[PDB]
Ligand binder design. Structure first.
Ligand SMILES: [Cl-]
Length: 294
């Protein structure tokens, strides 16, 4: 029946972690890094978000509700004067170089930065360029390590505990870092130290991911929207700068569309846009993502 093939891969065999995660990094992840990425998902039942996410991707018009939501935030982004910083690599996964270049020209107030060879987790291939460029860009606004040496923070959100990194000073505009699938705040570990000297860095683990709680949800995008909206409010955030990636970019752009006065800049990379046909998905990943959605 529907879903059996993709669930066997992602839920039973843990393919998103053991296979697709390496497919998203140009360099080889170390065993220590793999173990940090594996930690939330040792129990197969906890792998639901890893499977629902690729089934939410807006590919070939489906699911229609996600396609519409993403089209809406992309239209918002095209009409917004907010400062934008777009990182891209070659060949990319979600964003081919030609699309990055086009968006750098068509989006208002947008600087683009080539990180060199990159797939999906650009932060793993060139953290020092991404971090240093974010830090320089923040200084203009009108506002590779394997460890995770951050003090834990936890906040109750709609009755569920969410984990986050929170470092840097409390007397400015904070920078909110949003990860995607199948990562956690760990993906930002080598970016945050470039920013923390000047700006507060807040990096939550999405519900069901990282060190956040694992409620019995379907882990649709709607669930992530609800929990991230409530996380932001539970921290009392007013205005923010966003640094977003992958499904975290869908969260960040959708939040910005709904809260435009509160977004003072967006840095983004390997982000969710509508993929009109399977031909626009990279061949090396096409049979994999088709199977995930079977
Ligand atoms: Cl995904």
């Amino acid at each position: 029946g529907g879903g059996d093939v993709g669930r066997k891969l992602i839920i039973d065999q843990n393919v998103f972690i053991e296979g697709t995660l390496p497919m998203g990094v140009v360099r080889p992840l170390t065993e220590v890094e793999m173990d940090h990425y594996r930690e939330p998902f040792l129990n197969p039942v906890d792998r639901e978000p890893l499977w629902r996410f690729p089934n939410e991707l807006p590919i070939a018009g489906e699911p229609a509700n996600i396609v519409a939501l993403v089209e809406e935030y992309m239209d918002w982004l095209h009409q917004s004067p907010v400062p934008k910083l777009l990182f891209w690599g070659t060949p990319g996964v979600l964003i081919p170089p030609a699309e990055a270049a086009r968006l750098a020209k068509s989006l208002p107030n947008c600087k683009a930065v080539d990180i060199g060879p990159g797939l999906n987790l650009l932060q793993e291939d060139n953290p020092d360029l991404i971090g240093s460029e974010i830090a320089r860009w923040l200084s203009t606004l009108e506002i590779i390590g394997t460890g995770f040496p951050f003090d834990p923070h936890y906040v109750e959100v709609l009755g569920e505990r969410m984990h986050y990194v929170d470092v840097g000073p409390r007397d400015g505009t904070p920078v909110l870092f949003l990860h995607g699938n199948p990562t956690s705040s760990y993906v930002w570990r080598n970016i945050i130290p470039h920013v923390a000297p000047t700006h507060r860095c807040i990096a939550p683990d999405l519900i069901g991911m990282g060190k956040s709680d694992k409620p019995d949800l379907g882990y649709f995008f709607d669930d992530h929207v609800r929990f991230m909206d409530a996380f932001i409010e539970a921290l009392g955030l007013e205005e923010v700068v966003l640094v977003i990636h992958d499904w975290g970019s869908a969260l960040g752009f959708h939040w910005a569309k709904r809260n435009p006065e509160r977004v003072k800049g967006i840095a983004f990379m390997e982000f969710i846009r509508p993929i009109p046909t399977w031909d626009e998905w990279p061949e090396f990943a096409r049979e994999t993502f088709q199977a995930f959605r079977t």
